[PDB]
Structure formats: C-alpha cells, structure tokens
Ligand binder design. Structure first.
Ligand SMILES: [Mg+2]
Lengths: 322, 338
C-alpha cells in the first residue's frame, strides 16, 4: 500500500533490461536510486532517479525499502549481506552466493530481521516457461503424466551446473522437490574435460509424485529434441527452442494436440508472452498483500542440492535418495 | 534344397507373420498346418496339408522345420517334443514360461545339433534396418546417443515393458551388446490400469559401445508421438517417426511377394541432418524396406548354406534378463548391476 522505494546496484545490461524498465513502469515501486560509477546513462530514460556513486550509499539511505543486487557475481554475498544488515529487503541476481554456506547465512539473517531475500532468474519470466505454466494452470492436457525438458545444442571445440540449473529450477517450481535423483552424465565430445551431456530423472516430485520427469541437455544434438514435451491424459504439448520477454514468432510456436470441449484439436499454439514485470509484481503482492513469493532464495539452495545429487548419482552409479 | 515346414497354429500369428512368408519363400514348403477343427488355410494355401494335432507334425519323418506358434502355455512342451523328434524349431514369444526351461531347450537343441530359433521380427522393421544402414555407413560420425521409443495413445483400458520393451531391448542388444547396469522407471499412468503402461529404460555401458547413451521408452499416453528413433553423433542426427507398415498390410491379407514390399514414403522416411563431405545436409533419408521375410531367408541360409543364425533362442533369454532387471530397478528404487 506504500510505494516500494528501490535502489538498483548496477546499470549494465541487466539493470537496463531486467530491472529498471519494470521498477520504473510498476506503480507500486519507485526507481529511486541507481549506482553508476562515473557515467549518467540512466538520466535519459529515468530522469527522476538519483544517481549515486557507490553501493554503500544505497544501504545508508533510510528511505530505501528494496535493493536489487545485480552487480558482478563476486560482490553478491557481501552486498546482499550489507543490505540485509541495513534493514533492506533484497533481490540478488543468480548466482546467489559463491557457496551454500554463505547462502544459508543470508537466508538466516533475512529471517532474523523479517526481510525478503529474493533471487532473480530471468528465465522464469520467458514466454516459453510461462506458456507451459499456463497450459498446466488451464489443464489443457487433462491430467499431466509426463514432463520433459531439454536444452539441445550442437557445438564442437560443466553442463549440468550451467544449464541443469535452469531445468531443475523450472521443474521444482512446477512440481516440487523429488524423493530421489537419477542422473547419467557424459563427456561425448573428443578432448572434453567437463560434462557436455546429462539426463536427469526427478523421481516422485512432491506436488505431483506420479508425473514422470526428464531433464536433458547435450552439445551433440544436431537435430534438436524438444525444449518442452508434456503429455497428459487428453493430449500433448511439444515445443522446440530457437531476451524472450515478448511474444514468439510463428516458427517458434509449440504444437498443442489435445481434446477441447470433447473435440480433438491439433494446432500450432502461440502461447502467452513473456512477462519480465511479473517478477516485481509478485514482490509487490508478497510485501504489500502477503501473497506467496515465487522467488525465495531457498529455491536456489534446493536447485544446488539437486545438482549435487545428480553428480553423486553419476559418480557413484546409484539412485540418490534425498 | 527345400525346407519342409510344419506350422503349429493358424491363428492370427500363423496367418500374419508365418504362413505368408513360408509360402512365398521358394526355399520353404508350407507343407503341413495344424488346425484342430477348422479348415481356414484351404482358401489361401490349398497345397498345404491340414493336420489335427501337433504330434502329427513331430512324428512326420519328412518335416525339417516346425514353427511353434501355439498358445503360450504349450511352448516349452511343444518345442521340446519337436526337438526330441529331431526337428529344427522356431518358437514364438513367449519362448518358455521360465528361464530354466529355456536353458534346458537350448542345451537339448545343442546336444542334438538342431536349430532352436526365437521369432523376433522387429529386427526387420523398415526403421531399424534403416538405423543399421546409417550406422554401417557412419553417416552420423561417431554415435553418442541412441533413443528408441514406441509412442502410443490409448486413454482407456502383461505389461508394456514385456510386450513392447522386449522388441526395443532386443534391438539395442543387437547393436550395442549387453549393458553393465540397468535403470528403469515404470508407471501405470492411466486411470484403472492394472499393469505398466509406461517405461523408460537406460542400458548403462553396453559392451560393444560403452560410451553411447541408451534410452528405451514406451507409453500409452503420448497423443503427440515422440520419435521412433533419435540418434545423435559427432557429425549429425537421425530422427524417425511412425511404425513399420508390414503388420497392417499382412493383417489385411496382402501378399508379401511384390517389389515394393516394406517400402516407406518420403513422408515416413526419417530426417538425416549431418555433414556429408564437408557440407551440411538436411533431408529425408531413403530407407531400407521392411523385410519380415528376412527371418525365414536367414533360417534357410543357416540350415542350407551354413551361415550364422541371427535369432538364437539365447537372444530372448538375454532380453528377459534385461526386462527382469528393469522390473527390479523400478520395484527396488535402485540401479541394477548385471
Ligand atoms: Mg517509505
């Protein structure tokens, strides 16, 4: 009900694309202060923001309700820590912290002080994932029985950490944490030193324990597997991959093949647009209206636990129970 | 020169998979057909002799080969009777009710110097034959991944892992050998279902290619079908949809003799996306025709020309070992090491 005065820690790509346009347009937030080291780039589009020269200046201002930590990766633990100690709610960009221990510390500190600690991941707000969420919300496939998600690439010259994070994040958000993890990893390309292939099964996710989950990525898929393939009792949705913050061109549309009002339909499906402002609207609804936050920092720790369970599964040739 | 053949039953399997090929192959005579009460074979095979019992096949001194395609419970007894009587034998799946019975039959046939084959016809599906061709020609470069799936959609109502998984596992073993370990996850995804109607199986480190990633899958709830095959290599990929058309044509009563038998259209062919002499190509791959007659042609080449038998009964025992490991992996929530 009171406007969330927001300090933005950096005005590089991420500040200009992921953060400032939505803090600005959202009427429940004020783009109040922006850190720029020497430049005044933000003046042109955001003339009512005040430019400060240092991060500490955001933490020392009692008017600030929220600090967005989108500075370089190495600064994240220190900066989020400074902001929380100063009594500010915090958004940190992925990667949240350099260690799990650090992440646990910050969550505990936020809990102690009654503050929000959110982790920003732009892919949560992309057209493709939101379209999948919407298909599920509307039960277009009937009762869902299978979910598959693959990052297909073709490149010669670790994947489970780099692309697995996004896939695991999205699966946990839709279906909850699994009882167990199977993973098989590969180094498929000659001369490779880190995994360039994985397949992961999340066994019995808490919200939908009967749904079969497959997460995959590979650098040797010259013909791509689907970015999403979903199967239900009434139908299927299959989507192939190419920020993704608007609508999608026809070439990118998924195929929806299902039963609607008792009639079989099989058509390319435009889906719904990306909604990068959704991140901030959810923060508003959480802080002001007490609604569930979709981006709690504990999510990231949960993804890391799954990533580690996947590497353990492969290394030990075992199903890892959680 | 000519293999005199007795067919143990003229039910569906008899009319679809066996009689049309034993008949059209010039190296076989469809000599005798067991029909216990009917005379259904007279219309299409009027030169065959109808007998009323299985014993009339095994006691026939002029029969070289007996095809055991009777109801499932007889198969051990019937194959044993045929072997003891000195005949070469084909058994349909299920080979035997137990593994011990199967091992017994294999040893008996070996002792007597008799052929014991198990009918596994999907080795001659158009799609799989085409896969063998692509691999033979190294079109994908070095293969790194093999996915094989039977996608079905039937949202209403022994398991799928036995019924369809047997075919997929057999194919995978033929190409890549036996795995070191098995992971499987099975499901009953349909309301009211009594047996598994979904499986995913990983055959981990197959002997002949231990770095190739293997996924075998089937489901009765895939309204939009996943590929029948998706193979990936260093240079490219091959992706195929659909199923072999032979069984439908044979069920309709089409005679398999003709030049275009087992052929697929350009639409049915798989997509090959790879590098051929330096250049990227992406096009439908003119495939190998489906050839269920190849099962019998192989039997002839084995018995008459001393060539290797492709379909040893031991192959199905190997397949069953994998199936049992898949069931154990699912039931016990563990990777099963062989
Ligand atoms: Mg205020």
């Amino acid at each position: 009900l009171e406007i969330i005065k927001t300090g933005l820690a950096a005005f590089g790509m991420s500040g200009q694309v992921f953060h400032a346009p939505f803090i600005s347009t959202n009427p429940h937030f004020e783009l109040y202060k922006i850190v720029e080291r020497s430049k005044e780039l933000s003046k042109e589009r955001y003339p009512q923001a005040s430019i400060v020269r240092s991060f500490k200046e955001l933490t020392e201002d009692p008017e600030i309700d929220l600090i967005v930590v989108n500075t370089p990766d190495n600064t994240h633990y220190e900066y989020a820590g400074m902001a929380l100690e100063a009594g500010k709610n915090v958004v940190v960009e992925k990667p949240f912290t350099s260690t799990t221990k650090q992440g646990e510390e910050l969550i505990a500190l936020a809990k102690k002080k009654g503050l929000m600690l959110s982790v920003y991941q732009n892919r949560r707000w992309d057209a493709d994932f939101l379209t999948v969420r919407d298909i599920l919300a509307k039960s277009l496939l009937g009762r869902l029985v299978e979910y598959e998600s693959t990052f297909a690439r073709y490149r010669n010259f670790g994947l489970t950490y780099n692309l697995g994070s996004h896939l695991i994040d999205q699966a946990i958000q839709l279906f909850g944490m699994p009882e167990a993890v199977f993973a098989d990893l590969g180094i498929l390309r000659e001369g490779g030193k880190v995994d360039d292939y994985f397949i992961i099964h999340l066994l019995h996710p808490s919200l939908a324990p009967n749904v079969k989950i497959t997460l995959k990525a590979s650098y040797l898929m010259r013909e791509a597997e689907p970015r999403f393939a979903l199967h239900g009792t009434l139908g299927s949705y299959v989507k192939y991959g190419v920020p993704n913050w608007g609508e999608e061109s026809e070439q990118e549309w998924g195929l929806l093949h299902t039963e609607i009002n008792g009639k079989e339909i099989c058509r390319k499906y435009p889906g719904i647009a990306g909604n990068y402002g959704g991140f901030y609207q959810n923060i508003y609804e959480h802080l002001c209206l007490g609604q569930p936050l979709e981006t709690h920092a504990q999510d990231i720790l949960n993804v890391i636990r799954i990533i580690e369970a996947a590497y353990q599964s492969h290394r030990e040739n075992k199903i890892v129970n959680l």
